[PDB]
Amino acid sequence: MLQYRIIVDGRVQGVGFRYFVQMEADKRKLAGWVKNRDDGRVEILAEGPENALQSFVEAVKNGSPFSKVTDISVTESRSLEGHHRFSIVYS
């Protein structure tokens, strides 16, 4: 299994981006979190098998049905923190 952190920018807020990422993690049974930052970026942390994890990132490149991503970045860790579920958060 693999962990990613993802950061996203563009038309990526006020579209349900948190909700769409939550269900896109859920439909792969990933675990992790999503937040949508005051600085304008989305931030995500996700954990799962690397193929599903990559496919989830490929979906994040689209964003919501209403997004226009203009930049995306990824970081990784070859060991998990071990999240139990995938959650929208605001911290």
Side-chain angles (χ1 to χ4, degrees):
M1 295 178 77
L2 181 59
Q3 174 190 102
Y4 280 172
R5 187 196 186 193
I6 308 94
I7 307 294
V8 202
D9 185 37
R11 176 181 166 87
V12 300
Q13 310 202 309
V15 290
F17 207 107
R18 279 165 279 193
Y19 168 77
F20 284 110
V21 173
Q22 201 294 321
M23 63 177 287
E24 278 298 298
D26 183 75
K27 70 86 166 294
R28 281 157 189 120
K29 301 183 176 68
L30 298 181
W33 64 56
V34 59
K35 66 179 72 182
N36 215 342
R37 300 171 53 91
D38 178 74
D39 70 46
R41 294 172 294 175
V42 199
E43 166 168 24
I44 324 180
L45 195 173
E47 299 195 308
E50 172 163 26
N51 178 68
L53 201 67
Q54 281 171 105
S55 306
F56 167 84
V57 179
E58 288 281 279
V60 171
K61 310 191 174 166
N62 179 83
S64 73
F66 318 101
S67 293
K68 177 58 177 180
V69 176
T70 57
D71 179 64
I72 186 176
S73 301
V74 183
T75 318
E76 70 180 271
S77 314
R78 288 280 154 183
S79 306
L80 302 191
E81 189 174 291
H83 293 76
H84 186 249
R85 56 160 289 135
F86 192 95
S87 306
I88 297 155
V89 303
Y90 305 90
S91 313

Short mmCIF file of all heavy atoms in Angstrom, two decimals, residues 30-84:
data_model
loop_
_atom_site.label_atom_id
_atom_site.label_comp_id
_atom_site.label_asym_id
_atom_site.label_seq_id
_atom_site.Cartn_x
_atom_site.Cartn_y
_atom_site.Cartn_z
N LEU A 30 -10.37 4.02 -0.60
CA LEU A 30 -9.20 4.70 -0.06
C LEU A 30 -9.53 5.21 1.34
O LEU A 30 -10.70 5.31 1.72
CB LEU A 30 -8.79 5.87 -0.98
CG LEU A 30 -8.38 5.49 -2.41
CD1 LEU A 30 -7.97 6.75 -3.19
CD2 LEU A 30 -7.23 4.49 -2.48
N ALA A 31 -8.50 5.60 2.10
CA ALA A 31 -8.63 6.26 3.39
C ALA A 31 -7.72 7.50 3.38
O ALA A 31 -6.80 7.55 2.57
CB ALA A 31 -8.27 5.27 4.50
N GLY A 32 -7.99 8.51 4.21
CA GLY A 32 -7.30 9.79 4.10
C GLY A 32 -8.19 10.98 4.46
O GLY A 32 -9.18 10.83 5.19
N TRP A 33 -7.88 12.16 3.93
CA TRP A 33 -8.71 13.34 4.08
C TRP A 33 -8.67 14.24 2.84
O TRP A 33 -7.77 14.14 2.01
CB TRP A 33 -8.34 14.11 5.36
CG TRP A 33 -6.97 14.73 5.45
CD1 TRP A 33 -6.41 15.61 4.58
CD2 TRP A 33 -5.98 14.58 6.52
NE1 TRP A 33 -5.15 15.97 5.01
CE2 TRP A 33 -4.84 15.38 6.22
CE3 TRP A 33 -5.94 13.85 7.73
CZ2 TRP A 33 -3.72 15.46 7.06
CZ3 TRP A 33 -4.82 13.92 8.59
CH2 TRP A 33 -3.72 14.73 8.26
N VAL A 34 -9.60 15.20 2.79
CA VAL A 34 -9.58 16.32 1.85
C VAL A 34 -9.96 17.59 2.62
O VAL A 34 -10.80 17.56 3.52
CB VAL A 34 -10.51 16.04 0.65
CG1 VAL A 34 -11.98 15.79 1.03
CG2 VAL A 34 -10.45 17.16 -0.40
N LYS A 35 -9.36 18.72 2.23
CA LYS A 35 -9.73 20.06 2.69
C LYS A 35 -9.61 21.01 1.51
O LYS A 35 -8.90 20.73 0.54
CB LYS A 35 -8.84 20.48 3.88
CG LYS A 35 -7.36 20.68 3.52
CD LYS A 35 -6.50 21.12 4.72
CE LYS A 35 -6.29 19.97 5.72
NZ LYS A 35 -5.50 20.42 6.90
N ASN A 36 -10.27 22.17 1.59
CA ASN A 36 -10.19 23.20 0.56
C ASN A 36 -9.78 24.49 1.26
O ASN A 36 -10.47 24.96 2.16
CB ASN A 36 -11.51 23.30 -0.22
CG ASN A 36 -11.29 23.65 -1.69
OD1 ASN A 36 -10.22 24.12 -2.06
ND2 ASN A 36 -12.25 23.37 -2.55
N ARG A 37 -8.57 24.97 0.95
CA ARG A 37 -7.80 25.87 1.80
C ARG A 37 -8.21 27.32 1.53
O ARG A 37 -8.60 27.66 0.41
CB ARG A 37 -6.30 25.67 1.51
CG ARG A 37 -5.80 24.24 1.79
CD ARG A 37 -4.37 24.01 1.29
NE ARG A 37 -3.44 25.04 1.79
CZ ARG A 37 -2.71 25.00 2.91
NH1 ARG A 37 -2.56 23.90 3.63
NH2 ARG A 37 -2.14 26.13 3.29
N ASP A 38 -8.04 28.19 2.53
CA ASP A 38 -8.36 29.61 2.39
C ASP A 38 -7.45 30.30 1.37
O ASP A 38 -7.88 31.24 0.69
CB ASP A 38 -8.24 30.31 3.75
CG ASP A 38 -8.53 31.82 3.64
OD1 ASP A 38 -9.71 32.20 3.47
OD2 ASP A 38 -7.58 32.62 3.76
N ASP A 39 -6.22 29.81 1.21
CA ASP A 39 -5.28 30.28 0.19
C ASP A 39 -5.71 29.94 -1.24
O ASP A 39 -5.12 30.46 -2.19
CB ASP A 39 -3.84 29.80 0.48
CG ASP A 39 -3.59 28.30 0.29
OD1 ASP A 39 -3.99 27.69 -0.72
OD2 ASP A 39 -2.91 27.71 1.16
N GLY A 40 -6.75 29.12 -1.42
CA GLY A 40 -7.37 28.84 -2.70
C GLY A 40 -7.11 27.41 -3.20
O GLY A 40 -7.85 26.93 -4.07
N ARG A 41 -6.08 26.73 -2.70
CA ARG A 41 -5.72 25.40 -3.16
C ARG A 41 -6.62 24.36 -2.51
O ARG A 41 -7.10 24.56 -1.39
CB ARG A 41 -4.24 25.12 -2.83
CG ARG A 41 -3.30 26.05 -3.61
CD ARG A 41 -1.84 25.91 -3.16
NE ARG A 41 -1.66 26.38 -1.78
CZ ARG A 41 -0.53 26.30 -1.07
NH1 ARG A 41 0.57 25.77 -1.59
NH2 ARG A 41 -0.51 26.77 0.17
N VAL A 42 -6.79 23.22 -3.16
CA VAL A 42 -7.28 22.02 -2.50
C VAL A 42 -6.05 21.32 -1.92
O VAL A 42 -4.97 21.41 -2.50
CB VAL A 42 -8.03 21.08 -3.49
CG1 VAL A 42 -8.93 20.09 -2.74
CG2 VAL A 42 -8.89 21.83 -4.51
N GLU A 43 -6.24 20.59 -0.83
CA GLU A 43 -5.23 19.69 -0.29
C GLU A 43 -5.92 18.37 0.05
O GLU A 43 -7.06 18.34 0.51
CB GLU A 43 -4.54 20.35 0.90
CG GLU A 43 -3.72 19.38 1.76
CD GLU A 43 -2.80 20.08 2.77
OE1 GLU A 43 -3.08 21.24 3.16
OE2 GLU A 43 -1.79 19.47 3.16
N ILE A 44 -5.21 17.27 -0.20
CA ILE A 44 -5.70 15.91 -0.05
C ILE A 44 -4.55 15.11 0.56
O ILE A 44 -3.38 15.38 0.28
CB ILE A 44 -6.10 15.32 -1.43
CG1 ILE A 44 -6.74 16.32 -2.42
CG2 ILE A 44 -7.03 14.11 -1.22
CD1 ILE A 44 -7.13 15.72 -3.78
N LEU A 45 -4.88 14.08 1.34
CA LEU A 45 -3.97 13.03 1.77
C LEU A 45 -4.76 11.75 1.54
O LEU A 45 -5.92 11.69 1.95
CB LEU A 45 -3.58 13.27 3.24
CG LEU A 45 -2.37 12.46 3.74
CD1 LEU A 45 -2.02 12.94 5.16
CD2 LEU A 45 -2.59 10.94 3.79
N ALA A 46 -4.20 10.76 0.85
CA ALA A 46 -4.92 9.53 0.50
C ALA A 46 -3.98 8.34 0.66
O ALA A 46 -2.77 8.47 0.47
CB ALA A 46 -5.44 9.64 -0.93
N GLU A 47 -4.54 7.18 0.98
CA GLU A 47 -3.83 5.95 1.28
C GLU A 47 -4.61 4.80 0.65
O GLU A 47 -5.84 4.76 0.75
CB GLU A 47 -3.72 5.75 2.80
CG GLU A 47 -2.94 6.89 3.47
CD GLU A 47 -2.47 6.57 4.89
OE1 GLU A 47 -3.27 6.17 5.76
OE2 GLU A 47 -1.28 6.83 5.18
N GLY A 48 -3.90 3.87 0.00
CA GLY A 48 -4.51 2.73 -0.67
C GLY A 48 -3.51 1.97 -1.54
O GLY A 48 -2.31 2.25 -1.46
N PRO A 49 -3.96 1.00 -2.35
CA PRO A 49 -3.11 0.36 -3.35
C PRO A 49 -2.76 1.37 -4.44
O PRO A 49 -3.61 2.14 -4.90
CB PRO A 49 -3.92 -0.83 -3.87
CG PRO A 49 -5.37 -0.41 -3.66
CD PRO A 49 -5.33 0.51 -2.44
N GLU A 50 -1.50 1.37 -4.88
CA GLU A 50 -0.90 2.39 -5.74
C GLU A 50 -1.64 2.56 -7.07
O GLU A 50 -1.67 3.67 -7.61
CB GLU A 50 0.59 2.04 -5.91
CG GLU A 50 1.35 2.90 -6.94
CD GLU A 50 2.88 2.82 -6.81
OE1 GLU A 50 3.43 1.81 -6.32
OE2 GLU A 50 3.57 3.80 -7.17
N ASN A 51 -2.26 1.52 -7.63
CA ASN A 51 -3.02 1.64 -8.88
C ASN A 51 -4.30 2.46 -8.68
O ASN A 51 -4.59 3.37 -9.46
CB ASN A 51 -3.36 0.26 -9.45
CG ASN A 51 -4.18 0.40 -10.73
OD1 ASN A 51 -3.68 0.87 -11.75
ND2 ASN A 51 -5.45 0.02 -10.71
N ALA A 52 -5.05 2.15 -7.63
CA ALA A 52 -6.27 2.88 -7.29
C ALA A 52 -5.92 4.31 -6.89
O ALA A 52 -6.61 5.24 -7.28
CB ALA A 52 -7.02 2.18 -6.15
N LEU A 53 -4.82 4.48 -6.16
CA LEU A 53 -4.33 5.77 -5.70
C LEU A 53 -4.01 6.66 -6.89
O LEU A 53 -4.46 7.80 -6.96
CB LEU A 53 -3.10 5.52 -4.82
CG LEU A 53 -2.77 6.67 -3.86
CD1 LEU A 53 -3.83 6.85 -2.77
CD2 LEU A 53 -1.42 6.36 -3.20
N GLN A 54 -3.27 6.14 -7.87
CA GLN A 54 -2.98 6.85 -9.11
C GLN A 54 -4.27 7.19 -9.86
O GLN A 54 -4.42 8.32 -10.31
CB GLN A 54 -2.08 5.99 -10.01
CG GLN A 54 -0.60 6.05 -9.57
CD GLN A 54 0.22 5.03 -10.36
OE1 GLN A 54 0.96 5.36 -11.28
NE2 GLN A 54 0.06 3.76 -10.02
N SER A 55 -5.21 6.26 -9.96
CA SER A 55 -6.48 6.50 -10.65
C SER A 55 -7.29 7.62 -9.96
O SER A 55 -7.88 8.47 -10.62
CB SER A 55 -7.27 5.18 -10.72
OG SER A 55 -6.50 4.15 -11.32
N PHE A 56 -7.27 7.65 -8.63
CA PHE A 56 -7.86 8.72 -7.85
C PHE A 56 -7.17 10.05 -8.18
O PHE A 56 -7.88 11.03 -8.42
CB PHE A 56 -7.75 8.36 -6.36
CG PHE A 56 -8.04 9.47 -5.38
CD1 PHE A 56 -9.37 9.76 -5.02
CD2 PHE A 56 -6.98 10.16 -4.76
CE1 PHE A 56 -9.63 10.71 -4.01
CE2 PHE A 56 -7.25 11.09 -3.74
CZ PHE A 56 -8.57 11.35 -3.35
N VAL A 57 -5.84 10.11 -8.27
CA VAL A 57 -5.16 11.33 -8.68
C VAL A 57 -5.59 11.72 -10.09
O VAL A 57 -5.90 12.89 -10.31
CB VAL A 57 -3.63 11.23 -8.52
CG1 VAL A 57 -2.91 12.51 -8.98
CG2 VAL A 57 -3.26 11.02 -7.04
N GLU A 58 -5.67 10.78 -11.04
CA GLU A 58 -6.11 11.06 -12.41
C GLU A 58 -7.49 11.73 -12.41
O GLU A 58 -7.73 12.67 -13.16
CB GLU A 58 -6.13 9.78 -13.26
CG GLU A 58 -4.75 9.23 -13.63
CD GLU A 58 -4.10 9.99 -14.79
OE1 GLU A 58 -4.44 9.72 -15.97
OE2 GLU A 58 -3.23 10.85 -14.54
N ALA A 59 -8.39 11.28 -11.52
CA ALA A 59 -9.70 11.88 -11.34
C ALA A 59 -9.59 13.29 -10.74
O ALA A 59 -10.26 14.21 -11.21
CB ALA A 59 -10.59 10.98 -10.47
N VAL A 60 -8.72 13.49 -9.74
CA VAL A 60 -8.46 14.80 -9.16
C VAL A 60 -7.93 15.78 -10.22
O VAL A 60 -8.25 16.96 -10.14
CB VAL A 60 -7.51 14.66 -7.94
CG1 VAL A 60 -7.00 16.00 -7.40
CG2 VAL A 60 -8.20 13.93 -6.78
N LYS A 61 -7.20 15.32 -11.26
CA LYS A 61 -6.76 16.21 -12.34
C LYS A 61 -7.95 16.82 -13.08
O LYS A 61 -7.84 17.95 -13.55
CB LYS A 61 -5.83 15.52 -13.35
CG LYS A 61 -4.66 14.76 -12.74
CD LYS A 61 -3.63 14.32 -13.78
CE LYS A 61 -2.42 13.70 -13.07
NZ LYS A 61 -1.55 12.96 -14.01
N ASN A 62 -9.07 16.09 -13.21
CA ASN A 62 -10.29 16.66 -13.76
C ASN A 62 -10.91 17.63 -12.76
O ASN A 62 -11.33 18.73 -13.12
CB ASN A 62 -11.32 15.57 -14.12
CG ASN A 62 -12.59 16.21 -14.68
OD1 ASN A 62 -12.66 16.54 -15.86
ND2 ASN A 62 -13.61 16.40 -13.85
N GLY A 63 -10.97 17.21 -11.49
CA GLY A 63 -11.70 17.91 -10.45
C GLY A 63 -13.18 17.51 -10.49
O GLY A 63 -13.51 16.43 -10.99
N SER A 64 -14.05 18.36 -9.96
CA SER A 64 -15.49 18.18 -10.06
C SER A 64 -15.94 18.21 -11.54
O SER A 64 -15.18 18.67 -12.40
CB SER A 64 -16.20 19.27 -9.25
OG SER A 64 -16.13 20.53 -9.88
N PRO A 65 -17.19 17.83 -11.85
CA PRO A 65 -17.82 18.10 -13.14
C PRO A 65 -17.82 19.59 -13.57
O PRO A 65 -18.17 19.88 -14.71
CB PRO A 65 -19.26 17.59 -13.02
CG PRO A 65 -19.19 16.55 -11.90
CD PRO A 65 -18.12 17.13 -10.98
N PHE A 66 -17.45 20.52 -12.68
CA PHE A 66 -17.55 21.96 -12.88
C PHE A 66 -16.19 22.66 -12.70
O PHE A 66 -16.12 23.88 -12.82
CB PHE A 66 -18.58 22.53 -11.89
CG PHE A 66 -19.84 21.69 -11.72
CD1 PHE A 66 -19.97 20.86 -10.59
CD2 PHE A 66 -20.85 21.71 -12.70
CE1 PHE A 66 -21.12 20.05 -10.44
CE2 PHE A 66 -21.99 20.90 -12.55
CZ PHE A 66 -22.13 20.08 -11.42
N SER A 67 -15.13 21.91 -12.38
CA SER A 67 -13.80 22.46 -12.13
C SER A 67 -13.08 22.81 -13.43
O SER A 67 -13.43 22.36 -14.53
CB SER A 67 -12.98 21.41 -11.38
OG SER A 67 -13.52 21.24 -10.08
N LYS A 68 -12.00 23.57 -13.28
CA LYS A 68 -10.92 23.71 -14.25
C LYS A 68 -9.64 23.80 -13.43
O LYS A 68 -9.24 24.88 -13.00
CB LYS A 68 -11.15 24.93 -15.17
CG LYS A 68 -10.01 25.19 -16.18
CD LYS A 68 -9.72 24.01 -17.11
CE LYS A 68 -8.63 24.40 -18.12
NZ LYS A 68 -8.30 23.29 -19.05
N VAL A 69 -9.05 22.65 -13.12
CA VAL A 69 -7.72 22.57 -12.52
C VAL A 69 -6.74 23.25 -13.50
O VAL A 69 -6.86 23.08 -14.71
CB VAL A 69 -7.37 21.09 -12.27
CG1 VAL A 69 -5.95 20.90 -11.72
CG2 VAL A 69 -8.36 20.44 -11.28
N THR A 70 -5.76 23.98 -12.96
CA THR A 70 -4.70 24.62 -13.74
C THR A 70 -3.31 24.17 -13.25
O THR A 70 -2.35 24.29 -14.01
CB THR A 70 -4.88 26.15 -13.68
OG1 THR A 70 -4.88 26.61 -12.34
CG2 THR A 70 -6.21 26.58 -14.31
N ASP A 71 -3.21 23.61 -12.04
CA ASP A 71 -1.97 23.03 -11.51
C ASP A 71 -2.32 21.95 -10.49
O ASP A 71 -3.35 22.03 -9.82
CB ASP A 71 -1.11 24.12 -10.84
CG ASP A 71 0.18 23.53 -10.27
OD1 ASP A 71 1.01 23.02 -11.05
OD2 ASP A 71 0.38 23.59 -9.03
N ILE A 72 -1.46 20.95 -10.37
CA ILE A 72 -1.58 19.85 -9.42
C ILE A 72 -0.15 19.40 -9.07
O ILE A 72 0.73 19.41 -9.94
CB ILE A 72 -2.47 18.73 -10.01
CG1 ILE A 72 -2.74 17.63 -8.96
CG2 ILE A 72 -1.93 18.16 -11.34
CD1 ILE A 72 -3.69 16.53 -9.44
N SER A 73 0.08 19.01 -7.82
CA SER A 73 1.35 18.51 -7.31
C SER A 73 1.08 17.33 -6.37
O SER A 73 0.02 17.28 -5.75
CB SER A 73 2.09 19.63 -6.56
OG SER A 73 2.34 20.75 -7.39
N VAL A 74 2.04 16.41 -6.26
CA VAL A 74 1.92 15.18 -5.48
C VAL A 74 3.22 14.98 -4.70
O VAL A 74 4.31 15.29 -5.20
CB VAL A 74 1.61 13.97 -6.40
CG1 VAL A 74 1.40 12.67 -5.62
CG2 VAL A 74 0.36 14.21 -7.27
N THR A 75 3.11 14.43 -3.49
CA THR A 75 4.21 13.91 -2.68
C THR A 75 3.76 12.52 -2.19
O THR A 75 2.56 12.23 -2.21
CB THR A 75 4.50 14.88 -1.51
OG1 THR A 75 4.45 16.24 -1.93
CG2 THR A 75 5.87 14.66 -0.87
N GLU A 76 4.68 11.65 -1.76
CA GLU A 76 4.36 10.27 -1.41
C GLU A 76 5.15 9.80 -0.19
O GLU A 76 6.19 10.38 0.14
CB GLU A 76 4.59 9.35 -2.63
CG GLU A 76 6.06 9.16 -3.02
CD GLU A 76 6.20 8.22 -4.24
OE1 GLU A 76 6.30 6.99 -4.04
OE2 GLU A 76 6.23 8.71 -5.39
N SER A 77 4.68 8.73 0.44
CA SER A 77 5.33 8.03 1.54
C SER A 77 5.07 6.54 1.34
O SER A 77 3.92 6.12 1.22
CB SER A 77 4.77 8.50 2.90
OG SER A 77 4.65 9.91 2.99
N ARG A 78 6.13 5.73 1.29
CA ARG A 78 6.04 4.29 1.01
C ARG A 78 5.63 3.48 2.26
O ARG A 78 5.69 2.25 2.24
CB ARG A 78 7.38 3.81 0.40
CG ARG A 78 7.57 4.32 -1.05
CD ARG A 78 6.78 3.47 -2.06
NE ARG A 78 6.46 4.23 -3.28
CZ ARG A 78 5.73 3.80 -4.32
NH1 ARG A 78 5.33 2.53 -4.41
NH2 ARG A 78 5.39 4.67 -5.25
N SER A 79 5.17 4.15 3.31
CA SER A 79 4.59 3.57 4.51
C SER A 79 3.38 4.44 4.89
O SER A 79 3.42 5.66 4.69
CB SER A 79 5.63 3.54 5.64
OG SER A 79 6.82 2.87 5.25
N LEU A 80 2.31 3.82 5.39
CA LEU A 80 1.07 4.52 5.71
C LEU A 80 1.14 5.15 7.10
O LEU A 80 1.89 4.68 7.97
CB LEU A 80 -0.14 3.57 5.67
CG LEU A 80 -0.39 2.82 4.35
CD1 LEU A 80 -1.76 2.15 4.42
CD2 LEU A 80 -0.32 3.74 3.13
N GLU A 81 0.29 6.14 7.34
CA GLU A 81 -0.14 6.53 8.68
C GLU A 81 -1.22 5.55 9.16
O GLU A 81 -1.21 5.15 10.32
CB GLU A 81 -0.65 7.98 8.66
CG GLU A 81 -0.90 8.51 10.08
CD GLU A 81 -1.27 10.00 10.10
OE1 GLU A 81 -0.40 10.86 9.80
OE2 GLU A 81 -2.41 10.34 10.47
N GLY A 82 -2.10 5.12 8.25
CA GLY A 82 -3.07 4.05 8.49
C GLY A 82 -4.44 4.62 8.83
O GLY A 82 -5.02 4.26 9.86
N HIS A 83 -4.94 5.56 8.02
CA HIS A 83 -6.28 6.13 8.17
C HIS A 83 -7.34 5.02 8.12
O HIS A 83 -7.21 4.06 7.37
CB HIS A 83 -6.53 7.17 7.07
CG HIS A 83 -5.67 8.41 7.16
ND1 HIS A 83 -4.34 8.50 6.82
CD2 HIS A 83 -6.08 9.66 7.53
CE1 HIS A 83 -3.95 9.77 6.98
NE2 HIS A 83 -4.98 10.52 7.41
N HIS A 84 -8.41 5.18 8.91
CA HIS A 84 -9.49 4.19 8.99
C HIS A 84 -10.56 4.41 7.91
O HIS A 84 -11.22 3.45 7.49
CB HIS A 84 -10.12 4.27 10.40
CG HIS A 84 -11.16 3.21 10.67
ND1 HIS A 84 -12.52 3.42 10.82
CD2 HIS A 84 -10.94 1.87 10.80
CE1 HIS A 84 -13.09 2.22 11.05
NE2 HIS A 84 -12.17 1.24 11.05
#
